[model samples]
Target: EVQNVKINYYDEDAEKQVAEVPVQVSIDTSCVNMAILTRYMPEGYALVSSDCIIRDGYVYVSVKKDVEIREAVLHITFETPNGEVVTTETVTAEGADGEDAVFRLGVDFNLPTGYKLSNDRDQVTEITIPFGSTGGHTMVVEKGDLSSIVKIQFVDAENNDEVVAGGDYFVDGDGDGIFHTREITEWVPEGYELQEVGDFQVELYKETPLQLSVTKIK
Candidate 1:
């Protein structure tokens, strides 16, 4: 069975600091495994030496006490016309007590997909992580242009101007302003054969559905 073990970090003068450590399991060997012990070793401390002594159900591991670390938290918001999406991310910066850590956006962390950083904000924003304190920064990302609706109309192949079947289709224009024939195309009407048309462009203010021509089965 596994349990949290207590470790004592000491200097050459025999001064000591105690820590509660979690490990996988206890071994019957007299000398504790440094590989296994360091794997679960807590942050902000380093091994004083490779030697660890086990006695009376306790593992005495030597460590350095002065090594400390700080963390930086980030709160990112993705804004779209429809709604807003939010997320929280974190970065760990390891250094001495006075030295701070610096992190870059889109380099050190992953950004949200299908969205771009707002124009007002720089793509490579630097985040400063103070050694003694921790806090979060709010960043904004803007989504692409909103989608528009395109009307899908089935027209008579012979008459060309007569409507046969039709419905409304929501078009994204492949995240731009252009759409393909396959996207707006729908199932053929009953007793009618399909006649595929060419691709069409989506306009911001236009509600045009490709007036596709379908031939009626004789």
Candidate 2:
């Protein structure tokens, strides 16, 4: 992966300084691999003269400056394949203190689920798809538009959740605006199963619309 590292510093007397000050610093990396160590190197700097000493998992570098010793800041940035991960830190030293600092940073990458559907129709509707380790199933719509002149019997499933299997008649059994109970049988084609049973109400429209409803039987 691509990697870039940057460093910055802050001091007390940076507000009232005339000449630019250059502070030398070194990165310590002895316990880390040199190949992985080089991934965090700073950019746009001349690497002419420096002392390298390894201790633990860190390599230390000695920094030097040629101009006046006023207060200034160092900014380090890293560019990596995952994205830009940035960190801002402060380095401070008085007149005789060695201006060196060490830091530890990490990077992480997260991937998203890749499963996708081809068409909008593949999305689910009101019906609940069954759960099982099987495939190759078929579905059928048995009844069409039912009018007030039709009587249909709806059978509730074993769990009493909804109507699953029943029969329907076309003639009205009572004077109510709904279809009355009629004797219907549970019909399943060969090699198929009835997962659930439910009744669907349909309205019939001639030159004028006719309202019809079906009731669930225990």
Candidate 3:
């Protein structure tokens, strides 16, 4: 019996439909041997399950996206238990619905002073990525154009007492920007060793912040 086959582009994170295709198939949906075949898999996306399953006259399917891309065509085959092609057609897929796209960004504050983070003017300090409503987003905290010299006084980690190293050394610390990291061998205080952090770049995942917790060390 010929029935309708719907290819549902489901996005599980949003729990919604991204796209939908309705096609006709001449196969028994009640048969356990009926299956979906494909010649070309879509780009930037893949099926939730390796193969498509048809039930109750409807074909169930979903997709996973690694990068943001648009407009893909997938050619799949409807086959019988014995691997005989019953029907074939091309399915077009697209981006998720505006309300269905689920992507997010966050900040990672690596402060050592135990002081709260704020902007230069005490207005906007804690960083938040300028996000995108569309797909394939990129946000960056670039290196500072001008050097920001903060005098990190050498002190005892336990007593917080000032330790005059007279040698005037520099450790791993943010340069008021994402500019550089010292050589693993050099850039130490005259007499003190360091366990410091650096200014750098990171690509974060959805809702995950590639953060740094760099403490000015001695």
Which parts of model 3 have CA positions greater than 4 angstroms off? 29-43, 67-218
Which residue pairs in model 1 clash with each other?
151-209
> Any idea what lDDT model 2 has?
0.27
TM-score, cand. 1: 0.46
Residue-level lDDT of model 2, residues 1-218, one tens digit each, is 32222222112233321222222233432233222222333332211111223333224432233322222222222222233333223322111123322222211111112212222233221121121111121111112222343333233334443443334344333323443223122333223344333442334422232222223342
The per-prediction tally of clashing pairs is 1, 25, 4
Q: Each prediction's TM-score against the native?
A: 0.46, 0.14, 0.25
Query: Candidate 3, TM-score vs. the true structure?
Result: 0.25
Q: In what order do the candidates fall by lDDT, top score first?
A: 1, 3, 2
Local distance difference test, each candidate: 0.57, 0.27, 0.37
Q: 126 in model 2: Cα distance from truth in Å?
A: 63
Error of 3 at 162 (Å): 99
Instruction: Score residue 217 of candidate 2 by CA lDDT.
Output: 40
lDDT of 3 by residue, 1-99 (tens): 577766665667668766666666556543211123222334455444322456654555556667443433333333333444444444343342221
lDDT leader: 1
Worst 10 residues of 3 by lDDT: 101-110
lDDT comparing candidate 1 with the true structure: 0.57
User: TM-score: which is higher, 1 or 2?
Assistant: 1
Clashing residue pairs for model 3:
118-125, 119-125, 143-178, 144-177
